[PDB]
Amino acid sequence: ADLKAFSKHIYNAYLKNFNMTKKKARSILTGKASHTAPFVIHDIETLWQAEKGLVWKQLVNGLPPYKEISVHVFYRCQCTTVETVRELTEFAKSIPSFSSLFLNDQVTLLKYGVHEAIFAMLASIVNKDGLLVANGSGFVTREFLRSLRKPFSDIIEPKFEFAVKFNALELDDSDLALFIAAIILCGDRPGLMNVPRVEAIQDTILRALEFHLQANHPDAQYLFPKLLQKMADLRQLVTEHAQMMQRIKKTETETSLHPLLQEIYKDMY
């Protein structure tokens, strides 16, 4: 009660804001709802094919001018990330009392949380071998992404490592809704004004998550503490990511960075 309602409201916000759920993604990856697989990108040729219709169906990509394969893929990563951020902000608007914070605090929370949330949600569209892209019309292999030149392969691999370990907790969409809401409502964010309010909201979300997990996964007893540890793991994974991003900006000078990402990484830690 109250937590059941809270959980359901968060879940519905999740379902309303994310086109690609873990449900849909698993359904595609196992082959039960499609009957014809997504287009597999695993090399230069198939990437080129995918960009002329098979996966992205426009005759000029509307991405920055690229001079090599690795940077092209990096730009694709930026596109996915930007649209996930967009969805995450819209999702945050439906969290109880998020919209009632100061606008500045909303911006702070999103700035410092979206990457943690993105890395958590990636596991829904990732398996050992690769990841879904373009709402599941494409599947990019992990071996291809490992084959990109340093430092871009270096940035991509850790997300696979984390996602594969995170998928072993076998959460479903209704768990993940509460998990990512709690990621966003973090009181530890630099420059937050109303820390106690945000901590109280996170308090509620996490109580609802504990409740929801005992209902949904009766036999997994220690699922809740591990998930809290997952949050801490995510923070460090983002720290490492940010370090590599710094190195990119230093050493890959005309690799362009989307303005939203320039803002997020601006002054970050």
* Interacting residues toward a second copy by CB under 8 A: 89, 102-104, 106-107, 110-111, 193-194, 259-260, 262-263
> Of 60, 80, 64, whose CA–CA distance to 254 is shortest?
64
Cα(6)–Cα(9) distance, rounded to whole angstroms?
5
Site membership for ligand 85B, residue 178 (CB under 6 A): no
- Binding mask 187-226 vs ligand 85B (x if CB under 6 A, - otherwise)? ----------------------------------------
Q: Could you give the string, one character per residue 22-61, with x where binding to ligand 85B holds by CB under 6 A and - elsewhere?
A: -------------------x-----x--x-----------
- By the rule CB under 6 A, 125 interacts with ligand 85B: no
Count CA atoms within 13 Å of residue 21 on its CB side.
17
102 binds, among ligand 85B, a second copy, none (CB under 5 to 8 A by kind): a second copy
Q: Closer to a second copy by CB, 17 or 194: give it.
A: 194
Which DSSP string do the residues of the chain spell out, in sequence order? --HHHHHHHHHHHHHHH-SS-HHHHHHHHHTSS-SSPPEEE-SHHHHHHIIIIISS--SS--SPP-SSHHHHHHHHHHHHHHHHHHHHHHHHHTSTTTTTS-HHHHHHHHHHHHHHHHHHHHGGGEETTEEEETTTTEEEEHHHHHTSPTTHHHHHHHHHHHHHHHHTT---HHHHHHHHHHHHS-TT-TT-S-HHHHHHHHHHHHHHHHHHHHHH-TT-TTHHHHHHHHHHHHHHHHHHHHHHHHHHHHH-TTS---HHHHHHHTT--
For 36, 165, 167, the CA distances from 33, given in Å and listed in that order, are 9, 26, 21
Judged by CB, which is closer to a second copy: 53, or 191?
A: 191
Q: Which of 22, 24, 111, 115 binds ligand 85B (CB under 6 A)?
A: 115
Cross-strand pairs, 132: 139
Q: Is 121 in the site for ligand 85B (CB under 6 A)?
A: no
**Is residue 180 close enough to count as binding ligand 85B by CB under 6 A?**
no
Number of residues in contact with ligand 85B under rule CB under 6 A:
20
Using the rule CB under 6 A, is 132 a contact of ligand 85B? Answer: no
Selection from a second copy, ligand 85B, none that 104 binds (CB < 5 to 8 A by kind) is a second copy
Considering the complex, what minimum distance in angstroms separates the CB of residue 14 from a second copy? 19
76 touching ligand 85B, by CB under 6 A: yes
Q: Which is nearer to a second copy, 164 or 260 (CB)?
A: 260
- Identity of the residue, 100 or 229, whose beta carbon is nearer to a second copy in the bound complex: 100
Q: Tell me whether residue 177 or residue 234 sits nearer to ligand 85B (CB atom).
A: 234
Interface residues toward ligand 85B, by CB under 6 A? 41, 47, 50, 73-74, 76-78, 80-81, 115, 118, 122, 133, 140, 155-156, 159, 245, 261
